[PDB]
Paper text:
Kirsten rat sarcoma ([name]) is one of the most prominent oncogenes in human tumors, found in approximately 30 % of cases.
In this study, we report the synthesis, reactivity, and structural profiling of novel compounds featuring cyclic aliphatic linkers. However, whereas a small shift of the 2’- and 3’-OH groups of the ribose by approximately 1 Å can be observed for compound 7a that is possibly induced by the highly strained and bend conformation of the linker, this is not the case for compound 7b. Interestingly, three molecules of RAS were found in the asymmetric unit, with the orientation of the linker near the covalently modified Cys13 modeled differently in these 3 instances, and the electron density less well-defined than in the remaining molecule. This suggests flexibility of the linker, which is consistent with the results of MS studies and indicates that the linker is less strained compared to compound 7a. However, it also suggests that pre-organization of the linker still needs to be optimized by further rigidification to contribute to an efficient covalent reaction. In contrast, [name] covalently modified with molecules 7a and 7b cannot become activated in the presence of GppNHp and SOS and consequently did not interact with the Raf RBD.
Residue numbers in the entry: 1 to 59, 68 to 168
Write the structure that this text describes.
Amino acid sequence: MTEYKLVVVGAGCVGKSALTIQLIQNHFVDEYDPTIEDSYRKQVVIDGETSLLDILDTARDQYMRTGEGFLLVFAINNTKSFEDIHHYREQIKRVKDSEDVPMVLVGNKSDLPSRTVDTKQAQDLARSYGIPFIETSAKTRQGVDDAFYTLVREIRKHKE
Ligand SMILES: *CCC(=O)N[C@H]1CCCN(C(=O)O[C@H]2[C@@H](O)[C@H](n3cnc4c(=O)[nH]c(N)nc43)O[C@@H]2COP(=O)(O)OP(=O)(O)O)C1
Ligand SMILES: [Mg+2]
């Protein structure tokens, strides 16, 4: 089976861990330790192809070198976390020495009403980067599979 090393990055408290845990364990862990940086593995079938996902939940430079695709996560109720996205993307470009790195922009906490980052803002940013944008809720699981599977599809497109 093919293996994909994915890396989840973004400001603190945006939901990187909650998203990863939903993908791996299929439940919403609300109070997860904010300091645990670790990799999780799960065998899934994506578009009929069996894949082993090796996902690093960031909170280290060994996985930025080996990571094949990156989830850029902000929270839709956290303007600063969206402003920080550019920093994370630039840091990945620097380590990869490349402008063509599979990435997906993720706007998490879509269940909340207290939104300060417009969907149009995020779509504008993703368009500028040339990457997909997916809105998620780790709480309700909305969009969680879509975010990670979309990233795998971008790595597959990249390799082909
Ligand atoms: C950082 C400030 C903060 O959120 N403080 C606390 C007060 C008490 C506990 N509570 C909490 O644990 O929030 C977690 C988590 O439940 C929440 N979260 C994550 N994803 C979602 C989502 O999709 N919808 C909603 N309504 N809440 C979500 O946010 C924090 C942080 O989650 P995390 O540890 O996964 O974030 P990481 O630092 O990026 O890993 C709020
Ligand atoms: Mg975390």
